[PDB]
């Protein structure tokens, strides 16, 4: 049929219990993740097609970018904790990869400030137990899917998206096929 194991998706040989329904891993240092978020808008388009009541989650990973990468995973935990993922995603991607103006923890904080998150609020979150828990949560999730690279997306901790099996000659077609696969898997 249209959808086929090994084509638009693969099946984890050891599924993850309690995983988020739709789980994307990315790194602000990853060029393909920059392509996913800034040119393809994968996550916005996936969200648009998700069935009623199925929600999507993004976690940041550390195996890219060294110490700054660890800071960016903690900053993303701040963004989840504060609900500002959509305020900071673009200036964090561009600051790391486009202008290369993000080179320290302080530079990341400046992005949150300029996006409306006051400094005292950012520091409180940065040093909070909630954020520590969210860092550990992101790391545990990637380990549980034996994550080896990004970007990556998993549905119900069972199925892994396989973009290499999709048509890449037209980006809008690729995005449509990617999002329709997430829709199909979420209903499976």
Residue numbers in the entry: 1 to 188
Question: How did the manuscript describe this experimental structure?
Answer:
DsbA from E. coli K−12 (EcDsbA) was the first and is probably the best-characterised DSB enzyme to date. This 21 kDa periplasmic protein is a dithiol oxidase that catalyses disulphide bond formation between consecutive cysteines of unfolded polypeptides as they are translocated to the periplasm. EcDsbA consists of a canonical TRX domain, a hallmark of proteins involved in redox homeostasis, with an inserted helical domain. The TRX domain harbours the conserved active site CXXC (C30-P31-H32-C33 in EcDsbA) that is featured in many proteins of the TRX superfamily. The acidity of this groove originates from a cluster of negatively charged residues (E24, E37, E38, D44, E85, D86 and E94) that map along a buried channel in the interface between the TRX and helical domains of EcDsbA.
The other three mutants, E37A, E24A and E24A/E37A/K58A, were crystallised in space groups P21, P212121 and P2, respectively, with four molecules per asymmetric unit. In this structure, the K58 side chain shifts towards the E24-vacated space, and this change disrupts the proposed salt bridge between K58 and E37. The latter salt bridge was also abolished in the E37A mutant. The hydrogen bond between E37 and water w3 was removed in the E37A mutant structure which has the effect of shortening the distance between w1 and w3 from 3.7 Å in the wildtype structure to 3.3 Å in the mutant structure. Furthermore, the E37A mutation abolished the interaction of E37 with bulk water. Overall, in the E24A and E37A structures, although water molecules w1, w2 and w3 were still present and coordinated to the remaining charged residues in the channel, the number of interactions stabilising these water molecules was reduced, with the E37A mutant also resulting in the water network being less tightly connected to the bulk water (bw1/bw2). E37A caused the most dramatic decrease in the initial rate among single mutants, which was 6-fold slower than that of the wildtype. In agreement with PilQ and ASST peptide oxidation assays, E37A caused the most significant effect among the single mutants, whereby it catalysed PapD peptide oxidation with a rate constant of 1.68 ± 0.12 × 106 M−1 s −1, which is ~26% slower than the wildtype EcDsbA. To investigate whether the water network had been altered upon the introduction of the alanine mutations, we inspected the DsbA alanine mutant crystal structures, which showed that although all point mutants maintained some of the w1–w4 molecules, their position was altered and the tight connectivity of waters to stabilising charged amino acids was considerably reduced. This was especially the case for E37A, which lacked the negatively charged side chain stabilising the buried water network and connecting it with the bulk solvent, which could contribute to initiation of the proton relay. We also found that this mutant showed the lowest oxidase activity of all the single mutants we analysed.
